[PDB]
Design an enzyme around this catalytic site. Structure first.
Site, short mmCIF file in Angstrom:
data_model
loop_
_atom_site.label_atom_id
_atom_site.label_comp_id
_atom_site.label_asym_id
_atom_site.label_seq_id
_atom_site.Cartn_x
_atom_site.Cartn_y
_atom_site.Cartn_z
N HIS A 159 -8.07 17.47 -5.73
CA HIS A 159 -7.76 17.17 -4.66
C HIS A 159 -6.22 17.03 -4.69
O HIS A 159 -5.53 18.01 -3.82
CB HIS A 159 -7.91 16.23 -3.69
CG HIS A 159 -6.98 15.73 -2.68
ND1 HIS A 159 -7.32 16.44 -1.55
CD2 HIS A 159 -6.49 14.64 -2.29
CE1 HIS A 159 -6.26 16.03 -0.77
NE2 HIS A 159 -5.53 14.86 -1.81
N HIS A 164 -2.64 19.84 -2.06
CA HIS A 164 -1.25 19.49 -2.40
C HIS A 164 -0.05 19.68 -2.91
O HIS A 164 1.43 20.78 -2.16
CB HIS A 164 -0.59 17.60 -2.77
CG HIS A 164 -1.65 16.47 -1.55
ND1 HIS A 164 -1.61 16.63 -0.31
CD2 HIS A 164 -3.07 16.21 -2.07
CE1 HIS A 164 -2.02 15.64 0.34
NE2 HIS A 164 -2.68 15.27 -0.58
N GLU A 204 -2.18 15.73 5.51
CA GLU A 204 -3.68 15.72 4.83
C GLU A 204 -4.73 16.13 5.74
O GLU A 204 -5.61 17.05 5.20
CB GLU A 204 -4.17 14.23 5.08
CG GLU A 204 -4.86 13.94 3.73
CD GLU A 204 -4.53 13.91 2.63
OE1 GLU A 204 -2.92 12.85 2.73
OE2 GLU A 204 -4.80 13.76 1.21
N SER A 223 -8.85 20.88 -0.99
CA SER A 223 -9.54 21.05 -1.45
C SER A 223 -11.05 20.48 -0.87
O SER A 223 -11.98 20.05 -2.40
CB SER A 223 -9.25 19.93 -2.42
OG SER A 223 -9.30 18.17 -1.24
C1 LIG Z 1 -8.60 5.06 1.72
C2 LIG Z 1 -8.56 6.32 1.63
N1 LIG Z 1 -7.27 7.19 2.15
C3 LIG Z 1 -6.76 7.90 2.22
N2 LIG Z 1 -6.03 8.41 2.71
C4 LIG Z 1 -5.28 9.59 2.85
N3 LIG Z 1 -4.21 10.02 3.17
N4 LIG Z 1 -5.99 10.87 2.27
C5 LIG Z 1 -7.14 10.03 1.43
C6 LIG Z 1 -8.22 11.48 0.87
C7 LIG Z 1 -9.68 10.42 0.56
C8 LIG Z 1 -10.46 11.88 0.08
C9 LIG Z 1 -9.68 13.07 -0.48
C10 LIG Z 1 -10.63 14.51 -1.00
C11 LIG Z 1 -11.18 14.60 -0.31
N5 LIG Z 1 -12.14 14.79 0.66
C12 LIG Z 1 -12.18 16.34 -0.67
O1 LIG Z 1 -13.23 16.13 -1.05
O2 LIG Z 1 -11.19 16.79 -1.86
C13 LIG Z 1 -8.61 13.67 0.10
C14 LIG Z 1 -7.92 12.46 1.34
N6 LIG Z 1 -7.40 8.64 1.73
C15 LIG Z 1 -8.33 6.49 -0.18
C16 LIG Z 1 -6.80 6.41 -0.83
C17 LIG Z 1 -7.29 6.91 -2.15
C18 LIG Z 1 -8.00 6.57 -2.52
C19 LIG Z 1 -7.29 6.27 -4.12
C20 LIG Z 1 -9.23 6.38 -5.26
C21 LIG Z 1 -10.05 5.30 -4.58
C22 LIG Z 1 -9.97 5.66 -2.85
C23 LIG Z 1 -8.75 5.23 -2.17
C24 LIG Z 1 -9.38 5.85 -1.07
FE LIG Z 2 -4.51 13.98 -0.42
#
Ligand SMILES: C[C@@H](Nc1nc(N)nc(-c2ccc(C[C@H](N)C(=O)O)cc2)n1)c1ccc2ccccc2c1
Ligand SMILES: [Fe+3]
Length: 280
Positions: A159, A164, A204, A223
């Site tokens: 990702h 990014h 995002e 991603s």
């Molecule tokens: C609650 C969640 N928040 C969050 N905020 C943003 N802006 N983007 C994302 C985010 C989460 C997952 C992905 C992966 C994407 N769906 C993919 O499949 O490539 C891309 C972005 N999560 C989050 C954030 C960071 C983490 C780090 C580790 C474990 C869980 C998390 C959850």
């Molecule tokens: Fe991100």
């Protein structure tokens, strides 16, 4: 009073779940601890530790990379497409090689002054946005579990690197990102939430209109093989990016988004955000 916020880049120094699909995999679990410890031990100024990725990790990267690259030419914004070949040349983006955070950090430093620091896992929106104020992007270094390469609710290095990095290399986008970070520094809780939501539905999950066509610039889409296809299917609902409305939209954190917002351009989204931050 104003809550604590970093005033210099080094101040960022001071900022597995048992149900994870990889928890019951012993090597996955142990390596996740390894990655977590590297990030925890990191301090500003250190070269980002380089990791020898395993065959399984590289296979998952390879699958993700191969399939996403089939979609980018028709789905990704031109700025993304402009920058990806440079990354492949200078940072080793290949089907059988995972780029190192230190290499991409150094590439970004020379292009837009962006840099990377490794993060063990979750950090608050306030903390993450605070990093952007210094053109610092907090990046995960581990790879998503092999069971689902097409979508994961947990951000991984695939990702960061494919979602990014190519846009952080674009001056207009880097400016847009930094300006959200700057606006967030010492801001109220309400302000941070609104800024974080606008970030979520632009950086995002944003779409843009380019030469009349919808393209994606959202890193979370770029991603995810499955969500990237879904976003432009087009069976998805789309709305114009409008900060005063967009900031009220719920950020979905375990599924595909319910709605995607369309920005006219990076410059336009930046200007709309400038007007919006004045009101908060
Ligand atoms: C609650 C969640 N928040 C969050 N905020 C943003 N802006 N983007 C994302 C985010 C989460 C997952 C992905 C992966 C994407 N769906 C993919 O499949 O490539 C891309 C972005 N999560 C989050 C954030 C960071 C983490 C780090 C580790 C474990 C869980 C998390 C959850
Ligand atoms: Fe991100």
């Amino acid at each position: 009073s104003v809550p604590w916020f970093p005033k210099k880049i080094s101040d960022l120094d001071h900022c597995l779940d048992a149900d994870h699909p990889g928890f019951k995999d012993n090597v996955y679990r142990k390596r996740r601890k390894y990655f977590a410890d590297l990030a925890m031990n990191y301090k500003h100024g250190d070269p980002i530790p380089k990791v020898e990725f395993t065959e399984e990790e590289i296979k998952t990267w390879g699958t993700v990379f191969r399939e996403l690259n089939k979609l980018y030419p028709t789905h990704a914004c031109r700025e993304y497409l402009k920058n990806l070949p440079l990354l492949s040349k200078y940072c080793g983006y290949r089907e059988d090689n995972i780029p190192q955070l230190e290499d991409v950090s150094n590439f970004l430093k020379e292009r837009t002054g962006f840099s990377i620091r490794p993060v063990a896992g979750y950090l608050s929106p306030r903390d993450f946005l605070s990093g952007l104020a210094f053109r610092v992007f907090h990046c995960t270094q581990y790879v998503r579990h092999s069971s689902d390469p097409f979508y994961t609710p947990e951000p991984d290095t695939c990702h960061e690197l494919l979602g990014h990095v190519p846009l952080l290399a674009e001056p207009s986008f880097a400016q847009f990102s930094q300006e959200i970070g700057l606006a967030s520094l010492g801001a109220s809780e309400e302000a941070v939430q609104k800024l974080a939501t606008c970030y979520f539905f632009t950086v995002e999950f944003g779409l843009c209109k380019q030469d009349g066509q919808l393209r994606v610039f959202g890193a979370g889409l770029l991603s995810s093989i499955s969500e990237l296809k879904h976003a432009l299917s087009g069976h998805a609902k789309v709305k114009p990016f409008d900060p005063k409305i967009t900031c009220k939209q719920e950020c979905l954190i375990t599924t595909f988004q319910d709605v995607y917002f369309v920005s006219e351009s990076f410059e336009d989204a930046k200007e709309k955000m400038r007007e919006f931050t004045k009101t908060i």
